[PDB]
Design a protein around this motif. Structure first.
Motif, PDB file in Angstrom:
ATOM      1  N   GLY H   1      66.252  -3.032  68.011  1.00  0.00           N
ATOM      2  CA  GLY H   1      67.384  -3.933  67.783  1.00  0.00           C
ATOM      3  C   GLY H   1      68.661  -3.230  67.390  1.00  0.00           C
ATOM      4  O   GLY H   1      68.624  -2.078  66.907  1.00  0.00           O
ATOM      5  N   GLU H   2      69.772  -3.936  67.563  1.00  0.00           N
ATOM      6  CA  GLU H   2      71.157  -3.440  67.391  1.00  0.00           C
ATOM      7  C   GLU H   2      71.359  -2.948  65.949  1.00  0.00           C
ATOM      8  O   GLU H   2      71.933  -1.886  65.720  1.00  0.00           O
ATOM      9  N   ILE H   3      70.982  -3.792  64.976  1.00  0.00           N
ATOM     10  CA  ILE H   3      71.226  -3.427  63.557  1.00  0.00           C
ATOM     11  C   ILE H   3      70.363  -2.243  63.172  1.00  0.00           C
ATOM     12  O   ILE H   3      70.881  -1.305  62.516  1.00  0.00           O
ATOM     13  N   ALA H   4      69.049  -2.226  63.509  1.00  0.00           N
ATOM     14  CA  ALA H   4      68.222  -1.057  63.166  1.00  0.00           C
ATOM     15  C   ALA H   4      68.813   0.195  63.815  1.00  0.00           C
ATOM     16  O   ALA H   4      68.823   1.240  63.201  1.00  0.00           O
ATOM     17  N   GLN H   5      69.247   0.104  65.088  1.00  0.00           N
ATOM     18  CA  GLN H   5      69.813   1.299  65.788  1.00  0.00           C
ATOM     19  C   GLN H   5      71.066   1.785  65.043  1.00  0.00           C
ATOM     20  O   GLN H   5      71.253   2.977  64.859  1.00  0.00           O
ATOM     21  N   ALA H   6      71.892   0.899  64.587  1.00  0.00           N
ATOM     22  CA  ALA H   6      73.128   1.278  63.819  1.00  0.00           C
ATOM     23  C   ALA H   6      72.753   1.912  62.497  1.00  0.00           C
ATOM     24  O   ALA H   6      73.376   2.884  62.081  1.00  0.00           O
ATOM     25  N   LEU H   7      71.749   1.383  61.815  1.00  0.00           N
ATOM     26  CA  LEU H   7      71.259   2.018  60.556  1.00  0.00           C
ATOM     27  C   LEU H   7      70.720   3.425  60.855  1.00  0.00           C
ATOM     28  O   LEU H   7      70.886   4.327  60.037  1.00  0.00           O
ATOM     29  N   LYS H   8      70.035   3.586  61.986  1.00  0.00           N
ATOM     30  CA  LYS H   8      69.537   4.929  62.377  1.00  0.00           C
ATOM     31  C   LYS H   8      70.727   5.865  62.632  1.00  0.00           C
ATOM     32  O   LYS H   8      70.638   7.090  62.350  1.00  0.00           O
ATOM     33  N   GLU H   9      71.814   5.372  63.214  1.00  0.00           N
ATOM     34  CA  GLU H   9      73.069   6.184  63.407  1.00  0.00           C
ATOM     35  C   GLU H   9      73.628   6.589  62.040  1.00  0.00           C
ATOM     36  O   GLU H   9      74.129   7.727  61.913  1.00  0.00           O
ATOM     37  N   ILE H  10      73.584   5.702  61.051  1.00  0.00           N
ATOM     38  CA  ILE H  10      73.999   6.069  59.696  1.00  0.00           C
ATOM     39  C   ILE H  10      73.116   7.195  59.151  1.00  0.00           C
ATOM     40  O   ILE H  10      73.653   8.147  58.568  1.00  0.00           O
ATOM     41  N   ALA H  11      71.799   7.118  59.340  1.00  0.00           N
ATOM     42  CA  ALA H  11      70.895   8.191  58.878  1.00  0.00           C
ATOM     43  C   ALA H  11      71.280   9.515  59.541  1.00  0.00           C
ATOM     44  O   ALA H  11      71.297  10.544  58.885  1.00  0.00           O
ATOM     45  N   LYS H  12      71.510   9.485  60.840  1.00  0.00           N
ATOM     46  CA  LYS H  12      71.889  10.728  61.565  1.00  0.00           C
ATOM     47  C   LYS H  12      73.188  11.308  60.998  1.00  0.00           C
ATOM     48  O   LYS H  12      73.313  12.528  60.903  1.00  0.00           O
ATOM     49  N   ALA H  13      74.184  10.471  60.712  1.00  0.00           N
ATOM     50  CA  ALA H  13      75.443  10.915  60.126  1.00  0.00           C
ATOM     51  C   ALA H  13      75.218  11.528  58.750  1.00  0.00           C
ATOM     52  O   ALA H  13      75.841  12.528  58.403  1.00  0.00           O
ATOM     53  N   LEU H  14      74.354  10.931  57.928  1.00  0.00           N
ATOM     54  CA  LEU H  14      74.014  11.507  56.617  1.00  0.00           C
ATOM     55  C   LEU H  14      73.354  12.885  56.800  1.00  0.00           C
ATOM     56  O   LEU H  14      73.607  13.775  55.999  1.00  0.00           O
ATOM     57  N   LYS H  15      72.521  13.015  57.809  1.00  0.00           N
ATOM     58  CA  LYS H  15      71.890  14.341  58.089  1.00  0.00           C
ATOM     59  C   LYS H  15      72.981  15.361  58.445  1.00  0.00           C
ATOM     60  O   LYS H  15      72.894  16.518  58.054  1.00  0.00           O
ATOM     61  N   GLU H  16      74.023  14.929  59.149  1.00  0.00           N
ATOM     62  CA  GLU H  16      75.125  15.843  59.510  1.00  0.00           C
ATOM     63  C   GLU H  16      75.873  16.271  58.235  1.00  0.00           C
ATOM     64  O   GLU H  16      76.317  17.420  58.121  1.00  0.00           O
ATOM     65  N   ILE H  17      76.014  15.367  57.269  1.00  0.00           N
ATOM     66  CA  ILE H  17      76.534  15.725  55.944  1.00  0.00           C
ATOM     67  C   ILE H  17      75.656  16.784  55.283  1.00  0.00           C
ATOM     68  O   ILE H  17      76.215  17.745  54.757  1.00  0.00           O
ATOM     69  N   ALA H  18      74.360  16.596  55.275  1.00  0.00           N
ATOM     70  CA  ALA H  18      73.422  17.612  54.732  1.00  0.00           C
ATOM     71  C   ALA H  18      73.648  18.974  55.440  1.00  0.00           C
ATOM     72  O   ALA H  18      73.740  19.987  54.752  1.00  0.00           O
ATOM     73  N   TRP H  19      73.758  18.990  56.750  1.00  0.00           N
ATOM     74  CA  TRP H  19      73.947  20.282  57.470  1.00  0.00           C
ATOM     75  C   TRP H  19      75.265  20.921  57.041  1.00  0.00           C
ATOM     76  O   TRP H  19      75.320  22.143  56.884  1.00  0.00           O
ATOM     77  N   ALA H  20      76.310  20.138  56.907  1.00  0.00           N
ATOM     78  CA  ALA H  20      77.614  20.662  56.455  1.00  0.00           C
ATOM     79  C   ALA H  20      77.551  21.245  55.052  1.00  0.00           C
ATOM     80  O   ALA H  20      78.104  22.310  54.771  1.00  0.00           O
ATOM     81  N   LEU H  21      76.805  20.601  54.152  1.00  0.00           N
ATOM     82  CA  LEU H  21      76.623  21.128  52.801  1.00  0.00           C
ATOM     83  C   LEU H  21      75.797  22.415  52.837  1.00  0.00           C
ATOM     84  O   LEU H  21      76.020  23.294  52.015  1.00  0.00           O
ATOM     85  N   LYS H  22      74.851  22.528  53.746  1.00  0.00           N
ATOM     86  CA  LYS H  22      74.108  23.794  53.893  1.00  0.00           C
ATOM     87  C   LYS H  22      75.082  24.897  54.326  1.00  0.00           C
ATOM     88  O   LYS H  22      74.903  26.054  53.868  1.00  0.00           O
ATOM     89  N   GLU H  23      76.026  24.574  55.222  1.00  0.00           N
ATOM     90  CA  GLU H  23      77.035  25.562  55.643  1.00  0.00           C
ATOM     91  C   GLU H  23      77.849  25.978  54.420  1.00  0.00           C
ATOM     92  O   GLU H  23      78.172  27.176  54.317  1.00  0.00           O
ATOM     93  N   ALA H  24      78.190  25.039  53.545  1.00  0.00           N
ATOM     94  CA  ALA H  24      78.928  25.333  52.293  1.00  0.00           C
ATOM     95  C   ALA H  24      78.112  26.259  51.413  1.00  0.00           C
ATOM     96  O   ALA H  24      78.694  27.249  50.895  1.00  0.00           O
ATOM     97  N   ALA H  25      76.816  25.980  51.241  1.00  0.00           N
ATOM     98  CA  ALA H  25      75.896  26.785  50.419  1.00  0.00           C
ATOM     99  C   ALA H  25      75.895  28.222  50.956  1.00  0.00           C
ATOM    100  O   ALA H  25      76.008  29.200  50.154  1.00  0.00           O
ATOM    101  N   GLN H  26      75.802  28.369  52.267  1.00  0.00           N
ATOM    102  CA  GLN H  26      75.773  29.699  52.923  1.00  0.00           C
ATOM    103  C   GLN H  26      77.081  30.408  52.680  1.00  0.00           C
ATOM    104  O   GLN H  26      77.029  31.702  52.417  1.00  0.00           O
ATOM    105  N   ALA H  27      78.213  29.739  52.786  1.00  0.00           N
ATOM    106  CA  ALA H  27      79.539  30.354  52.531  1.00  0.00           C
ATOM    107  C   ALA H  27      79.642  30.860  51.081  1.00  0.00           C
ATOM    108  O   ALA H  27      80.175  31.980  50.876  1.00  0.00           O
ATOM    109  N   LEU H  28      79.083  30.141  50.112  1.00  0.00           N
ATOM    110  CA  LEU H  28      79.091  30.598  48.705  1.00  0.00           C
ATOM    111  C   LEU H  28      78.227  31.862  48.556  1.00  0.00           C
ATOM    112  O   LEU H  28      78.659  32.747  47.789  1.00  0.00           O
TER     113      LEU H  28
END
Lengths: 30, 30, 30, 30, 30, 30, 30, 30
Positions: H1-28
């Motif tokens: 369904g449309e709403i579950a798929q949109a919530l899954k897109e939110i999860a994927k975006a949060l994972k992209e935030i996690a990857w960006a913070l890992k890049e920050a950790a590596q830069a430190l």
């Protein structure tokens, strides 16, 4: 639907946060 | 609808967070 | 409606997070 | 209603995050 | 209700994030 | 119920974010 | 259900944010 | 369904935030 549409806009905004954090990570590398 | 419009306001606020983090990234650049 | 009202209060709080991050970015410029 | 009141509690908690980030901004100022 | 209960647990967790950020701000003061 | 239990899992994950930020605060302390 | 499933995926992604922050905290210790 | 798929897109975006913070950790790390 408009609620699914609005949740997809929330996902896009979260991806913009991710990209900003990546730009931050590049600045810390500097 | 009211709820979709409020969710869209949340997306806009998240985008403002992304812009603020970009300002942080720029401040680290020097 | 009260649920849309409460989601708009969440958006306002997220904008307050954005403003705090902007204040952080100004402090890093210093 | 119960759900709107809980969403309002989430907004208040997000505002507390904003205040904490302002404290961080002030600590960076010196 | 259990959904309102669970949203109030989300608010409490967000307040724990706020408190952790305040502890971070104190560490930056140091 | 399934949805309340999933919202409670979100609260627990947010608490894990708070614990990680406390670890960050401690690392800044020295 | 698919909505509960998707909220559990959001919880998992938040835990990935927590783990990334822990990795950040270890880098600050360095 | 449309709403579950949109919530899954939110999860994927949060994972992209996690990857960006890992890049920050590596830069430190240096």
């Amino acid at each position: 639907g408009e609620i699914a549409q609005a949740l997809k806009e929330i996902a896009k905004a979260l991806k913009e946060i991710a990209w900003a954090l990546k730009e931050a990570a590049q600045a810390l590398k500097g």
